[PDB]
């Protein structure tokens, strides 16, 4: 496995979140609160978190899945999951 650094992970999640047709590219932000900044529902939050599930490969605990709100802290969560520092 090549040294997948957070910069690649950070780009992939935001691109997929922009790719997510219900989080439009112009209304997607780095700190995108799905409930408030983006106004999605709980089920879409499941769809969002499990989209990066298959898109990144690793696993998100359920007790951490519902907590994880914003792409910035999505980035930080995967950052502490593997412990990336570059």
């Amino acid at each position: 496995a090549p040294p997948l650094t957070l910069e690649a992970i950070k780009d992939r999640v935001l691109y997929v979140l922009k790719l997510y047709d219900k989080i439009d590219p112009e209304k997607l932000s780095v700190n995108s609160h799905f409930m408030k900044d983006l106004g999605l529902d709980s089920l879409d939050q499941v769809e969002i978190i499990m989209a990066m599930e298959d898109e990144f490969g690793f696993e998100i605990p359920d007790i951490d899945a519902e907590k994880l709100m914003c792409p910035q802290e999505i980035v930080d969560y995967i950052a502490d999951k593997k412990d990336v520092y570059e």
Binding site: L43, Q45, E47, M50, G57, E59, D62, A65, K82, D83
Partner: protein
């Protein structure tokens, strides 16, 4: 504490769709079935009186319990995965470094130099953090495992060393 009503369905909805993609296999087939069950999940989004949603819980949780795949796709790092708990045979606790012959420590001089200050950093931090944690804890002990922050001046987060010095997930 207790799992809230909308929290329990989120957990059941989680692996139910993972069960769906285990069943559908194909991405497009999963996408078609995931959206169909999304509306099915949204069919009675309204619940009003909590007793109705409890009955709606029972049918829903019974659905996703039978909805499991016979051999669901467990990821390699998933609990019970192929790569799960695989490299634990390589991670070794950080205190073992102190149990090194001086030759090995000398032949890794910079690392032990920064390990020493990290060992020093553990000292004052542990001192400050324990006299930080005792009074941050209200009477009756800690009501929950959540642990108070470093909200004082020049202070490190209490109970940090083993979290910070965790064996890195890729020990190699």
């Amino acid at each position: 504490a207790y799992l809230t009503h909308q929290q329990k369905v989120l957990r059941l909805y989680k692996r139910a769709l993972r069960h769906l993609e285990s069943w559908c296999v194909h991405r497009d087939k999963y996408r078609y079935f995931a959206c169909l069950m999304r509306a099915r999940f949204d069919e009675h989004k309204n619940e009003k009186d909590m007793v109705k949603a409890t009955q709606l819980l029972r049918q829903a949780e019974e659905e996703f319990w039978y909805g499991q795949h016979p051999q669901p796709y467990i990821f390699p790092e998933s609990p019970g995965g192929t790569s799960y708990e695989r490299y634990e045979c390589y991670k070794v606790p950080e205190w073992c470094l102190d149990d090194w012959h001086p030759s090995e420590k000398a032949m890794y001089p910079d690392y032990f130099a920064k390990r020493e200050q990290w060992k020093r950093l553990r000292r004052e931090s542990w001192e400050r953090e324990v006299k930080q944690l005792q009074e941050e804890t209200p009477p009756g002990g800690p009501r929950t495992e959540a642990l108070p922050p470093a909200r004082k001046e020049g202070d490190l987060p209490p109970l940090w060393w083993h979290i910070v010095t965790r064996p890195r997930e890729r020990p190699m």
